[PDB]
C-alpha cells in the first residue's frame, strides 16, 4: 500500500466527466484517470463534454455494407456457455436494423436493468441473434481531432511506423452493429493492450469486468470449467467463445463489477482487464486498441494463443529497445524477470 494501492482500493468501475480542455489530449487524460486508479477495475467509462460530437448524424449509414455478419449460436447451461459464430452473407445496415427491430429479434420489455440482465442469462441460448461485428471503417468525421478512434496517436503507432504492418481492428478502427442478446465473450485485448469503445447510437451495451489484479483467478476458474479447451490451448479465452455469468463468478469468489454504456459514451479497457457483455438492442459501436508506456510490460508477458494461425502477434522488440534500453539485452536473452504491479501507474 504505497499510495498506489490506496487509490481506488475496491478496484471498482469509475466514471469520468472531462472538460473540453482535458478531453483534448487523449494520452494525457488516460494517464490522469490511471492516476485516479481507474485501471484497477480493468474498465472505465468516460462521458465526453456534452458539446462534443464526432458526426453530424447517422441517416446516411443505412447503406453501409456489413461484409461478414455473424449468427451467435450459444450452447450451455448453469451459467457456463460456449459461443459459436456462424458467418452469414453480407447485408446492409437497413437489412440488419430491420431484423434487429423485427418482433422476432426485438428487445424484450422490462423495468429495471436487473430484469433485462436476468432475461439475457435466461435466453442467450435461444433465438441466435445476428451481430454485424468487426466491420472495417470509422464513423468519425475527418475533422474531429479529439479522441478520434481512427488516429489516437499513442505509442501503439510504432508498430505501423516501424514496420508498415496493419492489424485490422487493433491499429485500425472497427464498427460493431448489435441487436438484443448479441454478446462479447470473456477476454482481454490482443497482446493485452488497452481498448477504446465509443457507442455511436442505439440501445445500451452492458459490461462485466474483472480487475487485472485478479485476472489469473478468472483464468483458473475458466480452465477448470473447460479443461478440454485449456489443454489444447492455454490461452483459449482469446478464442472469444467463452461466456460466464456473474452468478457463477460470484459463486466462485471472483471479484468483478458491471456497468452499462449509453449512446455517446466511451468505454476504456485496461491491459489484462478481463471483460464481457451484451447489447440491449440495435446500436452501433466503434473500437480499436491503443497502448501507453505502462502497457509495454504487459505486452512482453502476454500469453498468446498458439492453436490458431492468424492470431494477433506483435513484436515487442521495438518497444523494449526504445523505452527499456537498459533491459533490451537482458530481455533478449530471456532473463527479464520483471514482476508486474497492476495497481502501479506510469510514474
Amino acid at each position: 500500500a504505497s499510495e498506489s494501492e490506496t487509490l481506488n482500493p475496491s478496484a471498482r468501475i469509475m466514471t469520468f466527466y472531462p472538460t473540453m480542455e482535458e478531453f483534448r489530449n487523449f494520452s494525457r487524460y488516460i494517464a490522469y484517470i490511471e492516476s485516479q486508479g481507474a485501471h484497477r477495475a480493468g474498465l472505465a467509462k468516460v462521458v465526453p463534454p456534452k458539446e462534443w460530437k464526432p458526426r453530424a448524424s447517422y441517416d446516411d449509414i443505412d447503406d453501409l455494407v456489413i461484409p461478414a455478419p455473424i449468427q451467435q449460436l450459444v450452447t450451455g447451461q448453469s451459467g457456463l456457455f460456449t459461443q459459436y459464430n456462424i458467418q452469414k452473407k453480407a447485408m446492409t445496415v437497413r437489412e440488419f436494423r430491420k431484423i434487429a427491430n423485427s418482433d422476432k429479434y426485438c428487445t424484450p420489455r422490462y423495468s429495471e436493468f436487473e430484469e433485462l440482465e436476468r432475461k439475457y442469462w435466461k435466453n442467450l441460448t435461444f433465438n441466435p441473434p445476428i451481430y454485424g461485428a468487426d466491420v472495417n471503417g470509422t464513423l468519425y468525421e475527418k475533422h474531429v481531432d479529439e479522441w478520434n478512434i481512427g488516429r489516437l496517436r499513442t505509442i501503439l503507432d510504432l508498430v505501423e511506423k516501424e514496420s508498415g504492418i496493419t492489424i485490422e481492428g487493433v491499429n485500425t478502427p472497427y464498427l460493431y452493429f448489435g441487436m438484443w442478446k448479441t454478446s462479447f465473450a470473456w477476454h482481454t485485448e490482443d497482446m493485452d493492450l488497452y481498448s477504446i469503445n465509443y457507442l455511436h447510437f442505439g440501445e445500451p451495451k452492458s459490461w462485466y469486468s474483472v480487475p487485472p489484479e485478479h485476472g489469473k483467478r478468472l483464468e483458473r476458474l475458466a480452465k477448470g470449467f473447460f479443461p478440454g479447451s485449456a489443454q489444447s490451448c492455454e490461452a483459449f479465452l482469446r478464442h472469444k467463445m467463452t461466456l460466464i455469468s456473474p452468478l457463477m463468478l460470484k459463486k466462485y469468489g471472483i471479484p468483478f463489477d458491471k456497468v452499462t454504456q449509453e449512446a455517446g459514451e466511451f468505454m476504456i479497457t485496461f491491459p489484462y482487464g478481463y471483460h464481457a457483455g451484451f447489447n440491449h438492442g440495435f446500436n452501433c459501436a466503434e473500437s480499436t486498441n491503443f497502448a501507453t508506456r505502462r502497457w509495454i510490460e504487459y505486452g512482453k508477458q502476454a500469453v498468446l494463443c498458439s492453436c490458431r494461425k492468424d492470431m494477433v502477434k506483435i513484436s515487442m522488440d521495438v518497444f523494449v529497445r526504445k523505452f527499456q534500453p537498459e533491459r533490451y539485452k537482458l530481455w533478449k536473452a530471456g532473463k527479464d524477470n520483471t514482476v508486474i504491479d497492476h495497481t502501479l501507474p506510469t510514474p
Binding site: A68, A133, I167, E168, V170, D190, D310, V312
Partner: peptide
Amino acid sequence: GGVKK
C-alpha cells in the same frame, strides 16, 4: 501480424 474478427 494477424487480424481481429
